[PDB]
Amino acid sequence: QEIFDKQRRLQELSEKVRTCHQEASALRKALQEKEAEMLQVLEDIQTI
Amino acid sequence: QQEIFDKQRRLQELSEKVRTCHQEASALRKALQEKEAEMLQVLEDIQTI
Amino acid sequence: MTQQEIFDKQRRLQELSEKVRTCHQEASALRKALQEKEAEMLQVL
Amino acid sequence: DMTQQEIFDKQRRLQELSEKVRTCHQEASALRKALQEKEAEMLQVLEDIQTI
Numbered sequence: 227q228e229i230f231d232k233q234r235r236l237q238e239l240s241e242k243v244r245t246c247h248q249e250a251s252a253l254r255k256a257l258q259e260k261e262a263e264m265l266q267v268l269e270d271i272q273t274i
Numbered sequence: 275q276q277e278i279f280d281k282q283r284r285l286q287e288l289s290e291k292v293r294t295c296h297q298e299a300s301a302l303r304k305a306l307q308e309k310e311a312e313m314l315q316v317l318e319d320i321q322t323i
Numbered sequence: 324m325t326q327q328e329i330f331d332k333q334r335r336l337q338e339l340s341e342k343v344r345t346c347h348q349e350a351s352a353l354r355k356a357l358q359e360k361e362a363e364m365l366q367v368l
Numbered sequence: 369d370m371t372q373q374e375i376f377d378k379q380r381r382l383q384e385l386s387e388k389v390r391t392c393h394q395e396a397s398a399l400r401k402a403l404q405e406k407e408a409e410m411l412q413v414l415e416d417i418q419t420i
Contacts, residue, residue, distance in 0.1 A: 229372050232323050236375065239320045240368050246313035247361050250306060254354045257302045261347045264295040264407075268340040271288050274281060274333075278329065282418060289414040296407045303400040310393045313361075317386045321379060325420050332417045339410045346403045353399060357392045364385040367378070 370378075 229370075229375075232372065232375060233370055235323050236320065236370070239316050239323075242316050243313055243320075243368065244365060246309055246316065247365060250309050250313065250361070251358065253302060253306045253309060254358070257299060257306060258351060258354060260295055260299050260302060261343075261350070261403075264292060264299070265344060265347065267288055267291045267295065268343065271285065271292075272337055272340065274284065278325065281329065285414055285417050289411065289418075292407075292414065293411055296411060299407065300404060303404060307397060307400065310396065314386070314390055314393060317364075317382070317389070321383060321386070323375065323379070328420075329417055332413050336410060336413050336417075339406055339413065343403065343406050343410070346399060346406060350396075350399050350403065353392065353396055357389070357396060360385075360389050360392050364382070364389060367381050367385055
């Protein structure tokens with residue numbers, strides 16, 4: 227399909243992948259932080 | 275009886291905190307589910323070049 | 324009776340609470356693994 | 369730059385690394401689904417205690 231057009235596709239796609247990673251990397255931290263907050267609440271519930 | 279009511283009230287306050295943390299987590303998971311697949315979606319395309 | 328019931332519910336609540344803790348710690352190890360796995364891929368890119 | 373062969377070579381390296389991510393993702397979906405229901409089970413038990 228012409229190597230220059232293949233190089234262009236590779237670039238755009240890689241960028242999109244890095245963007246998805248950076249986004250996912252921050253969603254996991256937010257999820258890990260949120261689950262950690264819930265555990266403190268649950269500990270308190272065992273006390274009544 | 276009063277004791278039960280108190281226990282219930284306390285459980286309810288903590289329950290509200292649990293619900294809020296769940297609602298966010300439930301949504302955070304959906305956002306993470308869709309995003310990780312979007313990543314895999316592209317990686318697949320990269321293999322199609 | 325009502326009391327017994329509240330107690331049973333409380334116990335079940337404790338079971339799930341510990342089960343959530345297990346899943347969380349299990350998720351924490353997976354997220355760290357997924358982190359390095361993606362980063363390993365990025366380097367390749 | 370980058371030649372076609374260079375692209376194929378990076379495409380193969382990718383495949384092995386991408387497959388591992390695919391696996392970890394499927395495992396993450398299973399845990400999240402399991403965690404989702406467990407938290408839902410808790411809220412229903414909490415609401416269950418509110419009734420006598």
